[PDB]
Write a protein that binds this ligand. Structure first.
Ligand SMILES: N[C@@H](Cc1c[nH]c2ccccc12)C(=O)O
Ligand SMILES: N[C@@H](Cc1c[nH]c2ccccc12)C(=O)O
Ligand code: NA
Ligand code: NA
Lengths: 386, 383
């Protein structure tokens, strides 16, 4: 439930029952033979795992520093690592006898992944989405609709991701007997930060074997972008006990840290309690403060408790990258390696490039390439221009 | 060079030298140990091969007949099978000492695949694209520029794919010393229909191994959509000598075969020489007729000569599906399996659905799901 001081279950008593039931089911199924057979089979045949680990030789040579490898989560079905979590939890839901999935989304990407897994497993899917986000993510909303899901605009509060999570929890209180709340990152009340991390850990287990195969040793650094923290947790977690492996999380610096238009909770936020967890949040009077990133998956005012924990014990370092740096990295990866990254992933690429220049040519960086940039084309067209 | 009577090399003198140099380079490198190390490496670590073979359980049970498996070329880097050919020909070009790629595109999908492969290997890339297609494919155009390619609008003729291929050929004649012309499907003069089919055959080889693992037998039917024919040849070719495996190719029926708006060359075209090859072409006083499909990859007025051959010897059957049926299958796959298919691929899905209803529950159909539908979201929305 806790990662040091961070985590917990700060919810009304009406959620205690659904959360206890989910904990019990997960403890039962997580190591179950049949559950893991089916999950692996879907991950393989439907999602396309394993993803490759790709040596970005041109990019490495251009920078003239450490070797840069990309863990190619951009190749998973759906175009992002979120699918690994959507399948794991949807399958758990199905083993729990649930017939409906609900989920929040802000960028839309989780909503799509949820819709895809619910279509796969024959479940009803309802997606809560703040109205400001719906307006800004018309194509992802359309994807969710083609996939058979219903999108429910949330008009309360600030009409964004924080408010969609709050509305989804209210729904789950009334519907948990047949509904599973499929949370999209390593956030929320226990057992969600644990479960989502466990479903994303496949990324690091694969990357560890692949890098051993490619280079005969562990990497010197692993770099991942941090919104809520699930792609980073998925790649970090199997290297947590390999003490020589540096772990770097990259937050959204937005228009700059001193601009106030960023989303860097670990860098600039303060301890707080929302959405059932004690973690770092960006807040003013204890209110959640508006956040921004050019990468819409990075725009959440909190961060997962397990990251707060790794930061506190100094197991992992957390840095920031601006919108402009990320954008430059997005263009550079496209032109240099023929890989169009998600703007989220482009944050991690931008930090890696900086980092590589300072290291020696026999050192190794693995970047988690959390998604592909098709979803971002409209935004990049508007901001970069034609 | 020929498939039965089809194919060939019917080009001006000025194209002979480039084609014969390509053909020698191909002979040299196709089985070369280093060339195949490099190919396999890029296909694995950059493209993501192998792609999985997926049992479409919900769809199969709903229809109630044959089991439907999908060969998931939607999961290749770039979201379509074109990447296999783009890699293989770009790498060839690189081994030949070329520094530049040119390529035609209509739908923009080949233009993107070529741009990606050029970027990967550090080549210059110029894409020839009919002005008509440029205006309908804003996002693919954008993709190509992000990948560092240049897009050259073509304003001659009808300003569509056939004209792009013409201009690319004219450029290649001038530039082949340092440029490779990376053609997009199993069409053109020898050795292109062979080279493209050889670089797609990986699809069939994987699918063969994968269906044996899954079901312990070969399939009853393999179904693929057919524009120029490359995804279909890639999946068919390794099964050509397995005499019990039926091969079905699905052409764009457009607004109906009666309607004048379709791209069903094998089904309603006539044999003719165009783009250096004898094959089936849709023709009016003998000029190449305008063509149409909702799936922009299926709108070439010709078809690859290896298909013309397979049809003639009756080793494969060719059918058509309309725009309407393809769009219904696009929606059905999305809702039932959580896979949004390319509108090209949705033609094969739509036919496999029809076929499956008529077949037994222990029979097996493999559909080549040649692409994902992200690229098609604008046009499906705009509808
Ligand atoms: N907004 C993103 C990522 C996301 C989903 N749920 C979250 C919860 C916390 C932080 C980020 C997220 C999306 O919906 O695709
Ligand atoms: N027009 C499609 C497919 C294509 C490329 N070249 C071709 C030649 C023949 C037939 C089809 C094609 C594209 O460009 O992506
Ligand atoms: Na944050
Ligand atoms: Na045709």
């Amino acid at each position: 439930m806790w990662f040091g001081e961070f985590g917990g279950q700060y919810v009304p008593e009406t959620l205690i029952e659904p959360l206890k039931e989910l904990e019990k089911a997960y403890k039962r199924f997580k190591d179950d033979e049949e559950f893991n057979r089916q999950l692996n089979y879907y991950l393989k045949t439907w999602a396309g795992r394993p993803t490759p680990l790709y040596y970005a030789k041109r990019l490495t040579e251009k920078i003239g520093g450490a070797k840069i490898y990309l863990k190619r989560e951009d190749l998973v079905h759906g175009g992002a690592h979120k699918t690994n979590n959507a399948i794991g939890q949807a399958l758990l839901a199905k083993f729990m006898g649930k017939t409906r999935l609900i989920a929040e989304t802000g960028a839309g990407q989780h909503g799509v992944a949820t819709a895809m897994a619910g279509a796969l497993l024959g479940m009803k899917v309802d997606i809560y989405m703040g109205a400001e986000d719906v307006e800004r993510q018309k194509m992802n909303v359309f994807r969710m609709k083609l996939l058979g899901a219903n999108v429910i605009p949330v008009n309360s509060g600030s009409r964004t991701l924080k408010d969609a999570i709050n509305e989804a929890l209210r729904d789950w209180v009334a519907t948990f007997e047949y509904t599973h709340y499929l949370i999209g990152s390593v956030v929320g009340p226990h057992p969600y930060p644990t479960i989502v991390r466990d479903f994303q850990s496949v990324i690091g287990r694969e990357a560890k074997a692949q890098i051993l195969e490619a280079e005969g040793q562990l990497p010197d650094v692993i770099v991942a972008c941090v919104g809520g923290g699930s792609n980073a947790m998925g790649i970090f977690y199997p290297f947590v006990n390999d003490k020589k492996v540096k772990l770097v999380g990259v937050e959204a610096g937005g228009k700059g840290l001193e601009s106030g238009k960023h989303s860097a909770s670990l860098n600039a936020g303060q301890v707080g309690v929302f959405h059932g967890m004690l973690s770092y949040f960006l807040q003013d009077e204890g209110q959640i403060k508006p956040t921004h990133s050019i990468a819409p998956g990075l725009d959440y005012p909190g961060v997962g408790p397990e990251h707060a924990y790794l930061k506190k014990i100094q197991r992992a370092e957390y840095v920031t990258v601006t919108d402009e740096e990320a954008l430059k990295a997005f263009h550079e990866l496209s032109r240099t390696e023929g890989i169009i990254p998600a703007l989220e992933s482009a944050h991690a690429v931008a930090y890696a490039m900086k980092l590589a220049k300072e290291m020696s040519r026999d050192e190794i960086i693995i970047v988690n390439l959390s998604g592909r940039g098709d979803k971002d084309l409209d935004i990049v067209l508007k901001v970069s221009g034609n």
